[PDB]
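cache lookup: miss for this entity combination. No prior model stored, computing from scratch. Input as submitted by user K.M.:
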Amino acid sequence: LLSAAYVDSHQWEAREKEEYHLADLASLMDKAYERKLPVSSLSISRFVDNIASREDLDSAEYYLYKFRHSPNCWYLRDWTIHSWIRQCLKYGAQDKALYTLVNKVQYGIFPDNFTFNLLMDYFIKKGNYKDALSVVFEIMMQEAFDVPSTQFLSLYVLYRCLAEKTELTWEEERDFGASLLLSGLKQRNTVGLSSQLYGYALLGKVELQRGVRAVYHGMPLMWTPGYLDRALQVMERVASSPEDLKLGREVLDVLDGVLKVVTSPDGSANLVEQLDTEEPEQSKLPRYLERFQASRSKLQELNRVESESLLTLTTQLVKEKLPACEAEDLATYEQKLREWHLERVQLIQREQEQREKAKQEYQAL
Amino acid sequence: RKKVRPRLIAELARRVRALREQRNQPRDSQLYALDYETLTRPHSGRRLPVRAWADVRRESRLLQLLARLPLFGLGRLVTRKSWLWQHDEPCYWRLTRVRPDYTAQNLDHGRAWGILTFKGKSEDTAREIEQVMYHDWRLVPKHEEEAFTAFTAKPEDRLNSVPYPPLLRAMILAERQKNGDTSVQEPLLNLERTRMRPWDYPAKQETKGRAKGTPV
Amino acid sequence: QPPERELSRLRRLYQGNLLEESGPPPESMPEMPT
Amino acid sequence: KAYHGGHLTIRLALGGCTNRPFYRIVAAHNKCPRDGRFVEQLGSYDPLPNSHGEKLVALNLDRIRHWIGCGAHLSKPMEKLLGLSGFFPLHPMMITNAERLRRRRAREVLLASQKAESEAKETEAS
Ligand SMILES: [Mg+2]
């Protein structure tokens, strides 16, 4: 979806970079770990910058692992993380980039929203919508849908994959539901409000079939039961809103299907997590089904339902709004490059001063 | 006297022993490791109490949540399942600093710092967090923070003064008459100066003890 | 008498190890049976 | 002994002979033996009814107030004595135990009435 300018690497490739042989730098880091001594963030930065081959990436992956399991893991720099993804794309190692991103806990690769779009867009153009979905799920796990550009790309991948996937497993429903909900909340357009109702519906299905702990456990989601209540509220809000807002017809069918399925179904971690006084969600389904029909009637009466499919609505939204976002993000990208350049120079200067002092210390000693 | 003589071996022993302790200090990844099949700590062979078994299998530790987040979740809010069950009002930590245990192969053990908000009332300074190795922590989602942290304080209704005990009240009134003070005022105790925190209130981790490094 | 919500909070905390709930005690000491 | 750590406490030290208990209320370091070194004697407790049927407690309330003001803890039996005297409020378990006794005698009275009703059925059978 993104333009060639967005994914162009002329600016990154023109960065001022120090020339250090990887073999020499490898030895320095190896000695520090043998002596249980901290390694500098500038040291790991120089290694990633001077990667020159596909084989070198494999060695850097090992050293990024070592840095994560070292005293100075927190100091891994943003530009080092961005250069890693840029190097992986350059030499054809996209699988390695996705591998480290999925295994963030081990390697410490937490890219920014711009880097996420670069990796996610590569897969989209190649037609690998299974790997692109993995990037979307990783963005959701980190709750990093802040930049508008990432929200549009994530919704395009999700809806395109959902259309192909007629059958959804409970884990898939949970992952898709969370990704839709978090991305949808940011957007106030028709596509955004449809994704919120779509996301709450899927999560509500998993809540009433497998329990509320399946939804929130290990997920960036709340633990309070009543996800189908959140879905119905979206319908009630649009119907009563003074402004004219519309919910796609496709989502309304999904919620109707979920309500019907749940309504008429066919070691020591066994706890009742809800108070006895509070009504269980299953007992509330009869009332929930009445609200849905009433809301649907009011929406159709007010002509607030969009017959167009969600995949077609999202495609139009991406075409109209994504071009503007690319210009804004690219301007911020240039500013970040200059900020990173200055911060890197400061670290190099500070290193030189301490080394000079180290000579003076030995002279005194 | 002068027949009391030096004990060089005793002095040598004390210093030598203390040095080894500093050299061979254990790490959080070892002291707080657990065997989930038996719910027993391998280091000391200490089997966890019975009331904790369900949560040990059903809940996560703090740095298990934070290891998956950028910057180890600095600025994020974290609550405890025990607090969620006991108190209706929001109880959480606002993370400020986080020191993972690099030795751990998953960075799942360490220490953290933050600002406490217990039962809706927030402290003014950051301090170290206790019970970080417990299976009780729940990370709050960013989109749910505003609804989670919303609190409206109710007017305090717990009595501020109470009567004196029956005998101690009679001794006070008797002293009044003896000294010439004539009054019918009822002696009253003031409870504002001495109000007790809840029993589950977070304690000072900085002054807490740490287990020794001798395995059982 | 405890509030009803608080009695439910304790039934969840000690679920599986509970005793029959007791009501208000007799107003006076029952006369010893003889 | 040369103790390291501990706090001052007000407790009952057991005296007397076999089947004839007698207590001395004392302020003592908590780590000392029950009947060993103490700091001050603060009274006495005789738990056996005397000729008049009175259990006799003596409390030096001026010295007791002095040692509570200096950090002295209280043993649970001594907290019960101060509650009965009126110098302290009644201990929570003194009230809870009295409530348990009331609920336990109510059952006994009800059972006797049920037995009497069952005995009445026997009388009806003749
Ligand atoms: Mg405790």
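stored under new cache key. Chain C has one helix and no strands.
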